[PDB]
Design a protein around this ligand. Structure first.
Ligand SMILES: C[C@@H]1O[C@H](O)[C@H](O)[C@H](O)[C@H]1O
Ligand SMILES: C[C@@H]1O[C@H](O)[C@H](O)[C@H](O)[C@H]1O
Ligand code: NA
Ligand code: NA
Ligand code: NA
Ligand code: NA
Ligand code: NA
Ligand code: NA
Ligand code: NA
Ligand code: NA
Ligand code: NA
Ligand code: NA
Ligand code: NA
Ligand code: NA
Lengths: 340, 340
């Protein structure tokens, strides 16, 4: 499994980017822009405490309250949430279970968060809010299968959640809601290939799921729905390059997809759709630096891509689509990924 | 009340703009881009039938299904919906009541559509889905007050719905959910001023509501929350000009607000934030043409603003942020606004 993303990042409901990572104390720490603009100063690192043994995953509730999901030292799923939009935090609370992957988090069309994680049986399990942005949570429920990567989840343009994960054959597999807001899940389906990273999945400007992963030759590959929220899927297509981290995907303000990954020389590289969301892909270009994690990309309140990656000093570094000079957010981050 | 918008417009879940207007037969007709790109050809006008006596208002359910709300010849609220995302339509169904305004439509954080309309008592009434993107609908319920414009609704950055309407003193009044997804509504509050148009309301890139309306001198005015999802509100500020239609507001792909209105010479004019979502406003610039409605603006799948307005031939005309030459979508539209 290619070197993981080290932070979970979100553009908050007041347009300030907030980043969540794991400190050398295995606590979750966060850092937020002081202002909703490219090149803003930062609050600096503030601890949410806890003791995590996964990548922490933040998600924005449909009422704007941030909620962080992470595996605990007891291998249960834990969460912590803002008690008001962009204000103070709850205490950590256990959602129980015994999980063996990073959590994958998405919200249903009814505002109920759904959390996916590998179980001790290596099956895909999930648990969900029983009310919009609210407990109590459901029972843990199995979607079966046997998976060998962290899962990734995205909503279809018709409101059906869809989960992607590597199988025991190293192929990309996926499973989906057959109706929004439901525990009517499909059978597992193979999209084939051989992937050597977690998959990442995004929704296109024309309402199709598209999945990115590293292949056996360490090139970036992608595959997509050929119709909105539906099969058949394309063949795998190479975006070439040689990448030494998981790829991170993000949509530009104009709908153009862009992918970030570490190269052989440990520099940050990127590749993007040109002209429009239906235009031809660029060639790889370097953004220099020396990074010791996969990059994480998010669009800021100015419509500019922002990229975060750990540096050789274990600080989190930032670069944005001006591109800007590399800037340090300081801190000391560890890779707590549950699957490496 | 300044000349109304003549169409309801939405960027659908597969990135194609769809427009809804009223034909000379008082039926609702729609027209959709063939492709998710600026300057796309159009399907041409297709009837949803019905007999409406308001502006029709389309809203996208959280599962991607379009739903149109309009007053019927019996003065009840009627609706019609897609049975699948971007596919076929239901039959018209009555939601009952007796309404005296255009409907104002928004979705709660739990995916339940809320529809607001003036009653025969000139109070603000509302009715809502009792389940995410689903009937059955609630009882009609009064929020009291006495209003003299069509209502406008927007969600706060903390998930609380907020409704704006002109009062008997010609001031801008507003009322809000004190909690998301609830019938706990606040008291009416006056934002003062004297408005001679329906208000339009939008959410800023930094999570604040901002309201635009024509003033007694026919200048464009605006007022805003000074903090995310909260008071106090700013003073009214003039954006000047002399406008002969309701203003239409839209957010650029980069968060910059932009307003469209008809000028004294019946040309389309616009004014925009420069530099960023926190930058200084431009001066008014003409986009020429001769329009016989207020304009309606929406962002397309290429991140470009698209504007629609009725022409002197009663066709719907289109111009986009290339700016492009004016292009006719043909058809023959009427202003069915319930308040003129
Ligand atoms: C604006 C343009 O956008 C591309 O997607 C890429 O990030 C380029 O480096 C940038 O200059
Ligand atoms: C790109 C730029 O955006 C502005 O908001 C305005 O629409 C201008 O006319 C356009 O040229
Ligand atoms: Na990262
Ligand atoms: Na937020
Ligand atoms: Na920055
Ligand atoms: Na939620
Ligand atoms: Na759903
Ligand atoms: Na920002
Ligand atoms: Na219009
Ligand atoms: Na749609
Ligand atoms: Na167009
Ligand atoms: Na809905
Ligand atoms: Na709500
Ligand atoms: Na479009």
């Amino acid at each position: 499994i290619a070197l993981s993303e080290i932070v979970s990042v979100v553009n908050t409901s007041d347009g300030r980017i907030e980043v969540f990572g794991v400190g050398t104390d295995n606590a979750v720490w966060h850092n937020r822009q002081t202002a909703p603009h490219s090149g803003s100063s930062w609050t600096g690192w503030i601890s949410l405490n806890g003791k995590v043994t996964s990548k922490p995953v933040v998600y924005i509730n449909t009422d704007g309250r941030l909620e962080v999901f992470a595996r605990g030292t007891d291998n249960a799923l834990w969460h912590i949430w803002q008690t008001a939009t962009n204000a103070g935090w709850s205490n950590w609370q256990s959602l129980g279970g015994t999980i063996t992957s990073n959590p994958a988090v998405y919200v249903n069309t009814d505002g109920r968060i759904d959390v996916f994680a590998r179980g001790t049986d290596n099956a895909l399990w999930h648990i969900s809010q029983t009310a919009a942005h609210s407990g109590p949570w459901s029972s843990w429920q199995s979607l079966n299968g046997v998976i060998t990567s962290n899962p990734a989840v995205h909503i279809n343009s018709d409101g059906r959640l869809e989960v992607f994960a590597r199988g025991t054959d190293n192929a990309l597999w996926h499973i989906w809601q057959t109706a929004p807001d439901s525990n009517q899940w499909s059978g597992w389906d193979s999209l084939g290939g051989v992937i050597t990273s977690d998959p990442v999945v995004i929704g296109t400007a024309d309402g199709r799921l598209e999945v990115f992963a590293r292949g056996s030759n360490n090139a970036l590959y992608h595959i997509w729905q050929t119709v909105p929220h539906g099969g058949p899927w394309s063949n795998w297509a190479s975006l070439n390059g040689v990448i030494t981290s998981a790829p991170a995907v993000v949509k530009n303000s104009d709908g153009r997809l862009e992918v970030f990954a570490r190269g052989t020389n440990n520099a940050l590289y990127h590749i993007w759709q040109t002209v429009s969301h239906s235009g031809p892909w660029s060639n790889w270009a370097t953004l220099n630096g020396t990074i010791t994690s996969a990059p994480t990309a998010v669009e800021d309140a100015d419509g500019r891509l922002e990229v975060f990656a750990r540096g050789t000093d274990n600080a989190l570094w930032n670069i944005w689509q001006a591109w800007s000079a590399w800037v340090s957010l300081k801190g000391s981050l560890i890779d707590a990924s549950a699957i490496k």
